[PDB]
Symmetry: D2
Subunit: 112 residues, 4 copies
């Protein structure tokens, strides 16, 4: 079990205790089968998004409702190409403080 | 106490915000009641943003952290809450303290 | 529908949208049947606690797990007789900010 | 990056705290790693409380809001995390950002 994976497992423990409603883990393509097996053993919903120009995959996991949501606007897009609104909602799903998210939304709207 | 149900809820929401249950509150109040409401908010140092309503003799009074006050000014000013995109809708719900998995489902339904 | 009840209904709307995991409403004994019916229509778990020396009842509602929890230490006791620990956990169940709760715990431990 | 998995998680937790996902973090680290960890925390202005561990060459490093730092000093100092009452256990979990309904169930099991 490599470093990326030891860290993924830690995220699983936190999701189970209900720290947050969604997690994003970036892993090597080769480590994705194993990561997904660990999620399936626990019945934790997930959505994998391969990154076109790498051998790395964004593995989202969390409540089913947010898996269904991230598919409707993250599918086939880059995460750095999200609107300030889409970014707010990603951060909120990830468990970020809302006032914090309100601040970076304003910053996106102002800093441009 | 000696206040109407709208204002009891309004005060209740002031307590929630003060207890940190949520970052923003939307209160809708009769226009004769907002001088009192704004006095309460100013007294407690609570940032707010007032705006009109489809139903004329009422005012939407948002209050909460200054961060979200500045965010809502940016997308709610001059606009009905029923005219928002699904993404705008999620953001507003998230700011009001609504469960994020619930928001995801609602988003999926609209979208 | 009286003032206490118009306000209770508002709490129901907030619980449904998932603002918090538990709510406490204090109502007249006479208004409790109606309040409980509204909770049952929505399948919202609840626990009523009559207040001995009044005609008022503390109606807790929220997730089943916290209903089962408040029964193990609130049953047959006054809410103002809770330890600083029990108070922390009540506030946390009610959705209060945790740093806030850490502050009032310290204050209970210090202010005595 | 060039840091070990414990420290990547440690940094990750620093980001969570900074993003306001949770009010407190418990990191358990090898003793040679805590000078670095404390430097990171001091640099970012993050309050912390270090304490020993059943497993000798390791240190429990709690960090988070000053409010909860003062709370944990009060009931964790000199004490193993496995010696806590069910109520103490709930409080610690709540401070770490654990779902409150989950905490209620765990509390019921112990109690």
């Amino acid at each position: 079990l490599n470093s990326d994976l030891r860290v993924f497992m830690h995220h699983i423990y936190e999701f189970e205790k209900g720290v947050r409603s969604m997690v994003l883990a970036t892993l090597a393509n080769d480590d994705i089968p194993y990561a997904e097996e660990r999620l399936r053993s626990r019945q934790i919903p997930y959505f994998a998004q391969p990154t076109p120009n790498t051998e790395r995959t964004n593995l989202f996991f969390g409540c089913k409702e947010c898996m269904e949501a991230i598919r409707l606007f993250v599918s086939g897009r880059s995460l750095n190409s999200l609107t300030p609104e889409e970014d707010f909602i990603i951060g909120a799903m990830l468990g970020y403080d809302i006032c914090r998210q309100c601040e970076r939304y304003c910053r996106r709207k102002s800093n441009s």
